Write a structure and sequence with these properties.
The structure is cut from a larger assembly and holds chains A (154 residues) and B (96 residues). Chain A has 154 residues and is an alpha+beta fold. Helices cover 35% and strands 14% of the residues of chain A. It is classed as ribosome.
Amino acid sequence: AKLAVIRIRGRVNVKRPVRDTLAMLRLHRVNHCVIVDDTPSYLGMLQKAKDYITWGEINAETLAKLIRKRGRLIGNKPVTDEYVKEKLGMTIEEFAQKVVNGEMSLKDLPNLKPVFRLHPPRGGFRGSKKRSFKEGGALGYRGEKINELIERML
Amino acid sequence: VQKAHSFRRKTRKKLSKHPRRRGLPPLTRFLQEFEVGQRVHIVIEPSYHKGMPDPRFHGRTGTVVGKRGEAYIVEIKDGSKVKTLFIHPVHLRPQK
RNA sequence: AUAGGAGGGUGCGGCCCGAAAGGAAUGAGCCUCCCCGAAGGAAACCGCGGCGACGCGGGAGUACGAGGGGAGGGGACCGGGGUUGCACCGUCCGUCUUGAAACACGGGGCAGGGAGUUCGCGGCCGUGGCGAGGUUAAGGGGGUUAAGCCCCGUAGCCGCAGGGAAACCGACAUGCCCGCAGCCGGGCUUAUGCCCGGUGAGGGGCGGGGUGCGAAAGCGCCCGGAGUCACGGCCGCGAG
RNA sequence: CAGGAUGGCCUCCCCGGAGGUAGGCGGUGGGGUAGAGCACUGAUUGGAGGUGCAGGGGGCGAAAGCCCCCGGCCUCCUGUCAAACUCCGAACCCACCGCCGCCGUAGAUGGGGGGAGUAGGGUGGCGGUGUAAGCCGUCCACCGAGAGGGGAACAACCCAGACCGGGGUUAAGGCCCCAAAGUGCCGGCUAAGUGUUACUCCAAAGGGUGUCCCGGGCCUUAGACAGGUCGAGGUCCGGGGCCCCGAAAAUGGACGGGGCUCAAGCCGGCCGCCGAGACCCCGGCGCACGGACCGAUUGGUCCGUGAUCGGGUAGGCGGGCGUGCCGGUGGCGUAGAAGCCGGGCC
RNA sequence: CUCAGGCGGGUCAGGAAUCCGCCGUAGAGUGCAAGGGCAAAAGCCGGCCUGACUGGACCCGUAACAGAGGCGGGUCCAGCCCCGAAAGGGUGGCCUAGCGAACCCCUGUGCCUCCCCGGUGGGGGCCAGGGAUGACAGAAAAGCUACCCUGGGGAUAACAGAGUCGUCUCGGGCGAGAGCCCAUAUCGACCCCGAGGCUUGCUACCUCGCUGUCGGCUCUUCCCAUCCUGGCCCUGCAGCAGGGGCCAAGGGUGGGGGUGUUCACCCAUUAAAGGGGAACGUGAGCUGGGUUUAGACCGUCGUGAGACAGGUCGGAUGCUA
RNA sequence: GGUACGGCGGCCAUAGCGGGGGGGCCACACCCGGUCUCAUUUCGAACCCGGAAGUUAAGCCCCCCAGCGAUCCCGGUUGUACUGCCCUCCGAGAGGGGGCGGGAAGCCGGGGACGCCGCCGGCCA
């Protein structure tokens, strides 16, 4: 399963282990998203940094929309259907379907940056950034509901 | 009051044996053998007072780089320095 | 002459100046119309969900949108400056200190003056000359208005062999391995490039050797040629 | 001991050439803290049984010793402990190995050289100490050395780390007025202006048929309680929420102020808005690295990457502006030099 | 070979002399503190010995990470030896304390060396051991200052402010009781919970390129935990009075003796002659009696200079807003 | 290949302490006697030497147990005590709480457990 992880809290008052975990996850700034696997190592990293991020399962439609809108290449060039077809031979929707199914990975698309720099959500986060999602905040694991947040952040 | 470090400073429990393990240990650890490049843990046997390394290194894992007399030469990484110890095989345990 | 904050900051308004050096009659502020457009982004109205604030689908990614272009009208300002008003913000400068607006110290105004300099020794770097050699010192001759310029000057100093308190003894111009760059052969790749295998200066490690201590083994230092001079800079020590 | 030296932490240059480990997963080992417990060592209430056991008190006997009480010593039951106790024992930390992730041939790990500054720290959590304030360490988060948006102002608390000109959306938090955004919605509580306080500031023991509820017993709709008569719920207890009493200070005055009572307070939830230099987008600058092309002494033009460049005290490094004089080179000036006063442009 | 302690049995012999048996995980011992380790031993009893030796190498600790003179420790090579049948062990004490640079001097040993050369006496050098610096990473070493001076320090005391409230002042909870019965008219043990900043102490946060002290006089203002005046409640309140408590800060709360005194004591009156805050209010308003310089005396301490939070006499108070 | 035989060992109590029953082809013992080897701080008690008259009483070998000690598993106490990270959650304070990740000790009940394994030899076949 593919997990989308978005950084929530800022870069101040962060201790060294959590800061280095976030740097290894490539979440250097707020409103930044990455796609990883549900392997035990990644799960342990998410557990270590759970107080500053929110993660969940992402479906193929949301992944395709994210790639089309906020995906970028080296040099911050936009990702287009023509480029995707020329490099891989299929549409962005099919590429996202296969990535979610596990038959390929984002790295299969050449010169694709692994970080999506999202926009602040429409209507804002619907919870305090000091509590967890289960309590009503905006931190920690939220499951399938991460798709709604990604939709609000493009 | 500052107290300088000595060989037996604060070793009341570290260098104490289980009541049911009092006495001479089994001879397998005494007669065990190692090869160059093997990694070994350091578990000091309190009853044997010969070839004992500093208790500060008790519990660490080192690598065997030679053998002088009856004692093995063990290399450890204390911070960034390489430290060489001459440890009797009774104080050593193979890794895995 | 009814208004409060270290005397300022952002924006604009009122009054006033506005020849030159800024733009401008080859057209200013200004007025009207058309095209494209990033991130973002409504609503009238219709249908539905909720006790409610309200929300969801269509309208619609539409109207609008930083900015980028075009056309028409008019005919002298715009930029800039002095003062002041309004809205919001703003407790001076230097200094020791964990901590300065401080009821902690130095602070009436202006003009001039004012604080890492020189030598000797040493470490290092940037560059240049010569090179198993490098370099002159004091001084001498030629020439010159002149102290500038030209030539000579091997005494001396460092280096070429180190070890030892001393007596004293006295070493690889490459025997072997690993190996970066470069070179050579091959494979893939549009190309760059990557990989495999050799050779590999410099680099690293063995082996061997000189000497000191030792009865010896064995250890310390040294051994397969790069040093020397000059200009400039940083620093250490002694001189105020 | 207001001072120095060697290290640690910063910066600049060079050699060398393929590994490195701040985070995670699994494994191989180490530990005796928290908690707990009496199995050692030392404490600790009462009872029962055994032991004359060198004890004491009486009665009792010439003398050999008895009878009880108490005391001591063991076992069991009962009720309690330990920073200098442990038959047990976490969370967690450390060493090593494999892997994921990240960094590295645009040169890391590492090595050599040059220059420093620093030897008063503070707040915050934890530990020892103290009535407390405080003192002494530890953790490296924030101030020191840190802008902007808030807590009324605040070093430390929350958001947030910042090149320049613009557009948009969010963060802390807020929406009765001051003051941008609701006199917003559903259910309940408070009658004390309690409260209107995330933290830097906030009063207790003991009480309240003051109110709103939960649970458990006795009688229990003309068989209950109050005063054999009436004729519907009473009797008690243990709890939960808000509030009340306990509650006295000195210039006049503090929820920031006004003020606020089916709130503009509290409790359990929700809806929509407003709000930063944060995040997104367009344009510009510089920097780091790599590339092409071009300079008769350090360089110059242009392209490529930067989510992984842009705060800054001590300090290190690079470039540039200004002043007097000398060797050259090219010039200006009585048709007006230097200097001075007010303006325009870069 | 097995200890400490205990039990049972034994001539004097008993609590305790010596002896037999059994239980006995160390409850003994190991030179000396404590911790750790030791049971066919590291303990006890015997035999034989001097490895508590000579010439050297590497490594760990003091001093983690992360630099080190000196010192301590560990693993080994060689020589000469000791014990043992042999394996094996021996570089002091089962491990962790009992100790020390330069210069100089003394001793051991066998080499080098002293200015043209050689001999002798003497000197210098290399290696090893020793004499100590306890302020123990190594000066040789008594005090006063009130006649004091300089550079500084709120890195640091006294006065005052700030934090705290142990202490101080003032309350509260329960009720053993004392009150002829009756806990609550009144007092209220032993315990427990607080308020104030009005006593003192603690900290050292602001102030040492100066914020002028105590007391008194003058003057203004504030708090209530109320002494009198106004109004009430309980009473072990007959009246006159008392004891306890509540509301209430408009007004009053005075004059004198000794003492520098605040305070406390005393006197005669009075309705009463309240306690406190305002930089312990008020010295650019006063006075200067005390304290706290420079002079001097007494007592005590010191060899002395001298000192005393011990007395005693004298000892300056700046101003044009 | 069999053996209620022995020697040398590994883990070092789930293996120990204490009880009940059975056995000796061989083998192991108890046992008989001290000239020689060896010894008593006396003692042939131990150790040693020379043996097989007697015994399986016990050391030993085989089977069993759960009184003590130890220790493995399951259920309850219990996700209790304790604890890592974050927090604009409550509390006058002491302290507690929410989310994610770990998790005892002791006690009660029911089972387990009176050891497992390696090399070789003796006797018989």
